[PDB]
Amino acid sequence: MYLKAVIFSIADVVLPLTSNTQPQELKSRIDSELRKLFAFLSSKGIKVIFLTNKNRNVRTHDGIVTLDEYLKRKFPESIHFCRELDNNIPAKQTGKAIDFIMAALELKRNEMIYVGRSQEDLQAATNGNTLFINATWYEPVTEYGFQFSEPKEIARFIDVFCLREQLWGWQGHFNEDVHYYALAPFSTYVPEFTMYSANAKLSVGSPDFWIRYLGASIYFSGLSEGASFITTYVGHNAEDPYKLANIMEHDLKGLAVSFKGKYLKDLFLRHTTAIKSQVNITSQINTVNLNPAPIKNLITGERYTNPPKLKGKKILVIDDFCTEGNAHETARMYLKAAGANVINISWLKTINRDVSICEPTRKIRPWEANTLDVDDINYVGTIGYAENVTHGSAPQVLSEKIQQYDNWDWPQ
């Protein structure tokens, strides 16, 4: 098991608090779905924790009861860590209540996730470096994605992405600074399979499917630890380089929030159109660089006034396809030149294609255009495909995983 406990907060999750003008049938439906979720978790051996501050009064049809009485009668198979009832529990928003639960239940930090909605619970989860599961069935969120609109979505996320032994279908390392991960193997029989149309929706899967796959694998693998930045690469056409980022921006913002990191949508610039390749690697190197003024505030559009501080910072680079690695290696080359610690993550790894690892013989000016000759490339090694496929991973599983996700329903 990767996931051994799910923490639930109360406000706008178990009980609607912000509003008292909700659809009259919704609270009963949510209670029914929460019981299904908790029973599902129990059936998988996963503990249900309520983490609360006050043993607040709760109005019921029969009268007022305490929160502990309410939870124990409605959701008896649970663990209620309530600060008002136990002075040993640290203040939630410090993050240290996570440390308390880890010790009390003898669990690792990334053996738990944290379902909440309020800003106070977002801080409790993220300051405790636990994955935040943003529950939006009582209070909507418009600023970013990676949301869970009803309790069934949490069970679907867990069942599809969190219970399998293999979080990555392919992964490899080279020297001490090259780290490649891919969610699933991929093989096709057409020459240039597109993930999205020329002029936008995805062709394979969906934004919610991929962000949930990414979130689970990055988190339960331990790979999110210490990540400061998440970014995407750029398409080959300088006139339209952000088609993937544009589709995934909403959800990548939400994943960054949940990781206590920052999503830099336009850290990479495609200043000139290149040959599509993921072909000599100079085609990539000579047509991209780092943006010295990326968007700092995706709400306002305000840009950094000085280049982001990347030295010694861990950055997750996410792309859709990895074939021979020309895109990821170029992304790594620029970020490494700026002093960052780079993780290269792909949705899909093309089968029977090896990744050539490259290092420049000449110095890179990472924040502006560079023009390298083919002789300026040192091919230092290879992360092969066959040698690094994880057990049970085949190009046939992605189809089955999307089908399982798209048609998911409560089991019997």
Side-chain angles (χ1 to χ4, degrees), residues 124-244:
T126 53
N127 288 340
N129 292 113
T130 307
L131 187 69
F132 186 65
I133 305 296
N134 194 8
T136 57
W137 48 79
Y138 280 137
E139 290 296 335
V141 168
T142 62
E143 182 177 331
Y144 43 76
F146 190 47
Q147 314 173 10
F148 296 78
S149 66
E150 59 176 318
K152 181 185 183 157
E153 297 302 326
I154 303 174
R156 172 155 76 149
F157 170 74
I158 291 167
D159 198 46
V160 172
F161 303 111
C162 306
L163 306 184
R164 285 211 100 220
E165 304 192 66
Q166 286 329 293
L167 299 170
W168 303 106
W170 175 87
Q171 68 201 105
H173 306 264
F174 197 83
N175 295 334
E176 311 175 51
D177 59 344
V178 185
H179 314 276
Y180 274 67
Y181 304 80
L183 294 173
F186 179 80
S187 74
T188 189
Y189 51 93
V190 298
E192 280 166 299
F193 184 83
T194 61
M195 182 63 80
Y196 39 81
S197 63
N199 314 47
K201 265 161 150 292
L202 294 177
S203 69
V204 181
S206 65
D208 48 302
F209 170 85
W210 286 115
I211 201 76
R212 287 170 174 183
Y213 207 168
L214 279 163
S217 294
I218 294 161
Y219 179 72
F220 290 107
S221 68
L223 194 57
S224 67
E225 176 179 354
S228 296
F229 296 112
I230 302 168
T231 192
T232 42
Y233 195 54
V234 280
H236 73 276
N237 183 0
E239 304 293 341
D240 196 4
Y242 300 112
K243 282 325 211 213
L244 187 61

Side-chain angles (χ1 to χ4, degrees), residues 91-351:
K92 291 170 57 174
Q93 294 177 237
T94 71
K96 295 320 162 242
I98 301 305
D99 294 64
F100 170 90
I101 293 169
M102 288 166 58
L105 302 183
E106 295 300 334
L107 297 173
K108 307 197 295 147
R109 197 172 303 273
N110 69 333
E111 284 175 332
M112 313 184 313
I113 66 185
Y114 191 128
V115 180
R117 173 57 182 83
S118 74
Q119 295 309 299
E120 292 77 18
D121 285 299
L122 172 58
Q123 291 184 192
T126 53
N127 288 340
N129 292 113
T130 307
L131 187 69
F132 186 65
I133 305 296
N134 194 8
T136 57
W137 48 79
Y138 280 137
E139 290 296 335
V141 168
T142 62
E143 182 177 331
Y144 43 76
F146 190 47
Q147 314 173 10
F148 296 78
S149 66
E150 59 176 318
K152 181 185 183 157
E153 297 302 326
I154 303 174
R156 172 155 76 149
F157 170 74
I158 291 167
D159 198 46
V160 172
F161 303 111
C162 306
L163 306 184
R164 285 211 100 220
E165 304 192 66
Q166 286 329 293
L167 299 170
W168 303 106
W170 175 87
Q171 68 201 105
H173 306 264
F174 197 83
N175 295 334
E176 311 175 51
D177 59 344
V178 185
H179 314 276
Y180 274 67
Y181 304 80
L183 294 173
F186 179 80
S187 74
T188 189
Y189 51 93
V190 298
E192 280 166 299
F193 184 83
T194 61
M195 182 63 80
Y196 39 81
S197 63
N199 314 47
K201 265 161 150 292
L202 294 177
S203 69
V204 181
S206 65
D208 48 302
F209 170 85
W210 286 115
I211 201 76
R212 287 170 174 183
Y213 207 168
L214 279 163
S217 294
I218 294 161
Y219 179 72
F220 290 107
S221 68
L223 194 57
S224 67
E225 176 179 354
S228 296
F229 296 112
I230 302 168
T231 192
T232 42
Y233 195 54
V234 280
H236 73 276
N237 183 0
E239 304 293 341
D240 196 4
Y242 300 112
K243 282 325 211 213
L244 187 61
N246 288 344
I247 292 160
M248 294 303 298
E249 169 179 3
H250 192 60
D251 283 306
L252 286 166
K253 287 159 63 183
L255 186 61
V257 168
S258 179
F259 283 163
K260 204 180 174 185
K262 196 176 175 50
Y263 172 51
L264 297 174
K265 184 193 182 178
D266 64 338
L267 180 60
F268 283 98
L269 300 171
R270 179 78 66 181
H271 61 72
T272 305
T273 291
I275 308 154
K276 194 192 251 313
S277 65
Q278 293 164 300
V279 191
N280 185 267
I281 187 169
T282 58
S283 188
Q284 291 274 8
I285 294 163
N286 294 351
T287 62
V288 312
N289 56 271
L290 299 185
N291 190 351
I295 299 158
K296 182 202 201 127
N297 184 330
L298 291 163
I299 278 58
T300 66
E302 182 213 11
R303 304 181 166 277
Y304 286 80
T305 67
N306 309 293
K309 305 261 192 283
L310 303 185
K311 182 154 197 48
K313 296 299 173 223
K314 181 176 172 173
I315 181 160
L316 313 181
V317 179
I318 300 170
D319 209 0
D320 47 5
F321 294 96
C322 180
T323 299
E324 294 180 1
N326 293 267
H328 271 307
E329 277 302 279
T330 298
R332 187 177 69 74
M333 180 178 306
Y334 275 84
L335 291 167
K336 180 182 173 184
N341 293 322
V342 178
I343 306 294
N344 292 97
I345 293 161
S346 307
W347 299 1
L348 300 171
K349 175 69 198 73
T350 306
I351 68 167

